[PDB]
Symmetry: D2
Subunit: 321 residues, 4 copies
């Protein structure tokens, strides 16, 4: 059984070759996205694997898939026109909840200890003193609020509750197994009571700009906001006003609305990076990361490996569909 991969980064490669040899399956690979110009590669292959940057719109790819004997298209992570697939599609539902959870916790502790604000005082004003307004506090004294909790949210809960924190959380769906770690309550209560706020809901039209002005005047003025989920969840401009006028204490971001413009690219001009970004990046009580929350060996390993072993069971007869 032969497999054909697409969109591969050099970092995915080692784990690919480790699976290739471990499951004793022939694998062919390439960094380029799957097109009509690269379908020729899935010859013999029991499956094609993608990790798409973009839509695979043109439909003759599918024609060639089922003509070549490909049983399945397996993603490593909606980019698939599902109408044309009537081939089996698969995804990678879960790669490392702890990855994004750990980034979340990290950004929140950095801000809490107000490290960014101290380094500014130190480096620009040359002020190595301890001001009344920069006092910090222990994590167990705080109560954390989560807007949306799934695989990523719950890992965040287990960690903070473990550190002694009260976690309170709003989700439209009751999972009982989470009760050891958090108290379910309403949206507003979460915003009102929480010293750290972490976004973990999905992205839908209804959820776009979930967080804007109201919310921020509504947060504790001493609260920090954490978004390791999707930039479209936050009204960015709103955030920027909120921060300036001090309606929150800080924000930690792994993502911003319109991030695809510059996240993932290199060698940009001052002109190609947006001012809202440039403005936040400059705030000592903010931290931004280039959507890197997902980026651990475990994430990489599981993005490749889950999909290939799946792909092996499809060259014979799993839940990923």
């Amino acid at each position: 059984t032969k497999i054909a991969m697409y969109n591969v980064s050099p970092i995915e490669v080692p784990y690919i070759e480790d699976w290739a040899k471990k499951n004793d399956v022939e694998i062919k690979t390439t960094d380029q996205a799957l097109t009509s110009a690269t379908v020729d590669l899935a010859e013999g292959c029991s499956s094609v694997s993608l990790k798409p940057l973009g839509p695979v719109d043109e439909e003759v790819v599918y024609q060639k898939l089922s003509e070549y004997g490909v049983k399945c298209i397996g993603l490593r992570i909606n980019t698939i026109n599902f109408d044309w697939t009537k081939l089996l599609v698969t995804n990678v539902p879960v790669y490392s909840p702890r990855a994004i959870a750990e980034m979340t916790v990290t950004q929140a502790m950095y801000l809490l200890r107000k490290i960014g604000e101290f380094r500014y005082r130190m480096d620009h004003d040359h002020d190595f003193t301890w001001p009344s307004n920069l006092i910090s506090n222990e994590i167990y004294n705080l109560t954390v609020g989560l807007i949306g909790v799934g695989h990523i949210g719950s890992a965040v809960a287990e960690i903070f509750s473990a550190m002694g924190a009260k976690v309170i959380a709003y989700d439209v769906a009751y999972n009982p197994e989470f009760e050891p770690f958090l108290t379910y309550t309403d949206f507003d209560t979460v915003l009102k009571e929480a010293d750290i706020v972490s976004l973990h809901t999905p992205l839908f039209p209804s959820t776009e700009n979930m967080i804007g002005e109201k919310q921020l005047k509504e947060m504790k003025k001493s609260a920090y906001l954490i978004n390791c989920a999707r930039g479209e969840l936050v009204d960015t401009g709103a955030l920027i006003k909120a921060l300036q006028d001090g309606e929150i204490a800080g924000a930690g971001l792994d993502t911003l609305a319109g991030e695809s413009s510059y996240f993932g690219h290199t060698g940009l001009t001052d002109s190609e990076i947006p001012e809202d970004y440039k403005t936040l990046a400059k705030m000592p009580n903010v931290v931004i990361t280039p959507h890197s929350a997902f980026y651990t060996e475990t994430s990489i390993r599981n993005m490749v490996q889950i999909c290939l072993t799946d792909q092996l069971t499809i060259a014979k007869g799993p839940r990923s569909i």
Copy 2:
């Protein structure tokens, strides 16, 4: 029953009045140092309490103290170097300190720096802001903490608290202490110094500072660490030979470092209006490094810490007034 308080900063005040209500003790307060000028205020007090900025230099102070009948000089800090003890025995004067005030403050700073470094955060921001580069390079992939072993040198209040925390998160904690405490076995495994350095993905210092501990971390010790590993010092600068740490980072002996305290820190931390002349190249060299984070000995700086420095001090002195001797007494 009366206590005189010195060196009070605004920030202590609410814990001060708070404690004075909780216990029914009368408190006189001042933001000034204890000297010949101000010893007056100790009148009819059982104890004075300080958070000193310098030696208590004047014999007169101690004499006039035991002459008022002040039983004890309570410090609101661990440090008692600022007290002349020849003279505290000469005047039959007790001295107390606050040795333990908020271990989780520091353990939490420790963890925070570890995690920040581990997620390469400062290194991404660098690529972002200065090379205008937002890609994920190969060498900046991170790992989850439950896959790592964290290594403590010195396991005291702070060390064990680091252990309970990183252990709560599933990391393996190994540690070297000269002293065995069964209390800590649920959270760490004791090993030897050499091994802690050798096996650890994170090395965190928590031994006290002695002559026998000055420069405990040096060239040989940074050579023995992993290329991948991070050095954390939220303990004391003097544990680290700074030049050596610089050399190690530059030479890629280790991957990064988190510092709350520096050797020779005492001449710049907690100063303002410094001009480049008065801040060292030591600190400058470390601070431009994306894989280094430095805080200004702020590991302790939480409301719990401040509060406890007030209240632990004041109840220690209240029990001295009552005729007790608290273990906070310095001998």
Copy 3:
């Protein structure tokens, strides 16, 4: 809208009356099973709700159901096998898949800690020998120096892992399927190794034909003499004869059971003759290194609350042409 409930227990009532006054919904109830007779109360209902002990084997029930404009049968348990599914082509079926993982994880843990401390063994020497000494063969250990092994790890296996891991024990586990969300709490490994290394072996696979009698002689001899076997899963995972033999010979050090092969005769029954109660129960039950409970791992307020509320909320969702995921 209307929902009718059968198999209701006194304990369920408050939680139900709460969902009821909360959702603006009529609920009519009865302690007795769904049948030819009692189908008559499902009139006008969007749904019925069951917690059955027998198959609902009468066709008439189903037909009169689709006759009343009843949309769904919602089980308040996991096991939907008490439904004939051919006839449900008339009718939707929902279940309550997860209600308290932790209820069972905490029973599991309690029984382990109890044997590990040898309290039943001590009370035996105190009460029968008038002996209050402390013998060599009764020394115990701290949980963090022991390694806990899981055969099968689901919602329950992971909750258990979470707890033990949190107390500082090492956890190993065998599951046919890989779940990344469990790595902070356990290490995956092979079946054999779970048995060979563990000090406590707990079972959390599901009952299947290919799984019936998972634990027999081979496996018990392979466990550590000092190990403890926990079954808070399903009795049929364990061959009672083999278990009895092993405990008797010292091939394992003890066992905690909430469940037993054959248990249906007597679990759930009162006023029993000594005949009505089988000898293997009485034999394990006479042993001080055994603890047994009557299939109440599940039994907490959280489980009752959630078994009622999840199922009703699902029924409402289906009363509004919703389709919550507990469609079966």
Copy 4:
């Protein structure tokens, strides 16, 4: 540098031998108390180690020890009442902290066993032949419960870390404040602990002022559903009061490792019926009580630490150290 050891038991033997072997000391041993016949063994030795059952009250032994030229009496327990300090005039060292988690774990174990009603169920199964689930034997998940500690030291705090990890709310009364401890518990007053906890655990030391600290008034103050755990010291509880409160439904059950008046039979065999007390028998017959014979301490770790902390203390003595274990 040679050591004499007294009171050794079969289980200690191995850690003794492994430590003498690891540190190059010779040790001599004997199972009887140190008195004036066996003192003859401590000749040439730099220190002794006992684990006493009753007072060393012979003066020959003290001055014969300082004649043989021994420097300290190392105890392998916390309890020093047995050494006479008039006669030590000789240093005395004890072993103050040997395995907090051993006691904290018995505390937790007993607490979970109670909380899950395994004893009450065992009674209904074995005496009533009743294998059903009653309303009063509904149980609860630990994270929904709150744990109150009277007294918080090495042990009470270890109990706190454990219950905190499981997600319970922990609260404690102590006369002293321990910053190290705020992550696991919240300090408060005595009344409040009794008033709000679903489990009460005793961890205060025994002092004249603490004798009968939990008695009639305090038990009326606890909740009908609360359990009392005493893995601390029996004289802390008024057994009469406790028995009668259990009888009246003032509390829901209790878990005990120690009893006011235990030293008559705990650690003995084989008593007559007259020799095991009425109170004990009353409690032991209560399915909602659990009683272990002061085995809370009794682990591998504990035995080991008792031996090795004492011997190494004694070795730092022979080379001229004066370790903090010195009690004068």
